[PDB]
Structures are given as C-alpha cells and as structure tokens.
C-alpha cells in the first residue's frame, strides 16, 4: 500500500529553494535542505528536501525521483542518491519531500543525487551527533548489547501522527519567458498558467493572461517574469516566497514520526 498518501503525492510538487553552499556557493537546488533533525539516537536523520521524490508525477513506485528542472518536474529514477556528512550516510527511506537516512555524526549535512549529466547536490550546516540511549557514550551503534527505549524514526509511510501545513507556492521567477517580439519584450505562458506581469515603464499592470507582448518597455531586465502556478501546493519552506492571496488548504502529514523503538 504505497497508494495511501495521495494527500501529498497528487497535490504537492517538488519545491525548489536556495541551497546555501550548493557545491560552489548559493544556488537554487530543488533538493534544498531545510529542517535537519539530528535529534534521534539511532544514527538516523530525518531530512526535508524541497524536492518531492517518491511516486512519479502521477501514480507509481516510491523508488522513483521527481525534482524540479525548469518550471517543470522530472519524475524519473532515484539511481544515485547521496546523503552524506563527515562520512557517506545510508539511506533509510523516502516519502514525499522527506528522507530518512542513517548518518554518522557530522558538523554539517551534505545531500545530493546524480541526475546523470551533472552532480547537482545540496549541502547545509547542522550540528549532528548520535548518542545512543544508555550510560555509554558510543559514537556508533554496535551489533550486540541490551535493547532499551531509544528515540528513532520509522521506516514506513502509513503515518499520520503529525501533519505540517503545506499550502500553495507563491510565484516564481522565470525569465526564459520574457523573450523579445523583435523589438518588444515578449512574455509567454507554461500551459495557460497565470503570469503576473508589468515592467518599470507603464504597460499591462496585473498579468493574468496567455502569451502577452509588452508595448512600452523593451529590456528583459525591467519586467515581471512571474508564475502563479498554484495547481500543486508546496512545503512551507522559509525559502519560499508567500503566495500573497490566501492560506490555501493542503494540510499534509509527516511520514517519519519519532517513535519509541528499542534500538
């Protein structure tokens, strides 16, 4: 039953935000890491990418991989995920925007897949440790020893113990739109999506349109290339611009609840 959380799957999209040290420096990665939680004990961290891997765009196979390339998704295979820290981590499971992975301690957290043409990773600061529960201060879980009540995240998805708000995206920039109509700056639209448009000069002032032109201004660099494309909600990242209109619906669960496993 991978088909019980279309709350997120159908209705949420792979968000894209601003990774802080994205290989070189601050890029905008779809796998932009927020909410690192090295708060459990079992060598595990629950992470949120802004990317929503899991099923595809439509309906199949948790073990596929949908991030945002362009304005668009890319719902393809997960082939070469890499979470890592001081050492390479071990994936545990993904669901939605969210991945669980068994990591060692590390001053940072450093995430990344391989699309195939490019490394395309994302990295972040977060103080991580793994004390096991017990009066022994190990650095790592052993093969043996007593079992006792640790705190730890689940493998699974059939999970409702909490839910985080996930309402709409705000707009996003896309200056690939603002082409030139041989003398005027020319906006287009994805699929009839809602493009919010005007330039520093006086011309069309809202923009709720198909592909418009621009009578007044000429330069691409003085215009509103916007995409109100709220057919799919998002995670409410701090690295999201508000959808100014409203608090739309989209209350959406968390898979990886912290549970009372006996490590």
């Amino acid at each position: 039953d991978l088909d019980t959380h279309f709350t997120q799957y159908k209705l949420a999209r792979p968000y894209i935000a601003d990774c802080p040290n994205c290989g070189h420096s601050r890029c905008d990665s779809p796998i932009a890491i927020e909410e690192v939680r090295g708060d459990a004990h079992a060598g595990v961290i629950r992470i949120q990418t802004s990317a929503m891997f899991g099923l595809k765009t439509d309906g199949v196979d948790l073990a596929y991989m949908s991030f945002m390339n362009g304005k668009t998704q890319k719902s393809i295979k997960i082939d070469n995920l890499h979470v890592r820290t001081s050492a390479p981590c071990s994936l545990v499971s993904h669901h939605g925007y969210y991945i669980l992975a068994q990591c060692p301690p590390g001053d940072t957290v450093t995430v990344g897949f391989h699309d195939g043409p490019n490394r395309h990773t994302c990295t972040v600061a977060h103080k991580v440790e793994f004390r096991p529960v017990g009066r022994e201060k190990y650095r790592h879980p052993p093969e043996h020893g007593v079992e006792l009540p640790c705190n730890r995240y689940t493998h699974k998805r059939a999970d409702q113990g909490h839910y985080v708000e996930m309402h709409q995206p705000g707009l996003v920039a896309d200056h690939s739109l603002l082409s030139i109509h041989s003398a005027k700056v020319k906006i287009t639209v994805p699929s009839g999506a809602q493009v919010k448009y005007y330039c520093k000069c006086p011309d069309v002032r809202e923009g709720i349109t198909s592909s418009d032109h621009t009578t007044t201004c000429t330069d691409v660099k003085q215009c509103r290339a916007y995409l109100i494309d709220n057919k799919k909600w998002v995670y409410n990242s701090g690295r999201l611009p508000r959808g100014e209109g409203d608090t739309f619906k989209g209350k959406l669960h968390v898979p990886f609840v912290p549970v009372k496993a006996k490590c």
Partner: protein, 98 residues
C-alpha cells in the same frame, strides 16, 4: 525542543508589507526591505530598494514533543503501596497489593 517551523515569508516587490503580531506561540515577525531576491531566474522583483521581505517565524512543539519530552511536576506526598507476600502459617500463600 522547539521547532522553528517557519511560515514562508512574504516578498512584496515594490513597497512595504507591514507585519502584525499573529497569536502563534512566540510569533516573531519583522518586516525587511532592501532585498533583490534571487529565486530561480536571478531576482524577480523589479525594484531594488522597495523590494520588501517580511519574515515570520513562530515556535511549535516538535514531533518528538509528543514522545521524547521532559515533564515537570509539582509533587506532594501521596500514599505508599506494596505487593506483600505472606506465605502464612499453614495457609502458605497470599501475594496481595496493599
């Protein structure tokens, strides 16, 4: 432990967006101007100082708060108990809570 579950900030492109003190626990919110927010296409707001950014963040219980949580108490004296066994006499057994 808290979780700074940030609500996604507002970005008005040309002019101010006054914040209000929403009733969320420790609802910290502060308007900010003087931005030029690079979001996937370079910046997107065409102004350069009237670009406004309103950050808001409130505190919320972790998901671990339900399960991994300290717990205070005002503790009075109450009443003590025991599962007293008596293997009495020739009765030879009673294991009762008292």
């Amino acid at each position: 432990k808290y979780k700074t579950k940030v609500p996604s900030p507002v970005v008005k492109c040309c002019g101010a967006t006054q914040c209000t003190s929403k009733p969320h626990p420790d609802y910290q919110c502060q308007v900010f101007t003087g931005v030029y927010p690079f979001m996937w296409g370079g910046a997107y707001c065409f102004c350069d100082t009237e670009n406004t950014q309103m950050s808001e963040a409130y505190v919320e219980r972790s998901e671990e708060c339900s399960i991994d949580h300290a717990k205070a108490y005002k503790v009075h004296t109450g009443t003590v108990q025991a599962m007293v066994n008596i293997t009495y006499g020739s009765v030879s057994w009673r294991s009762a809570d008292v």
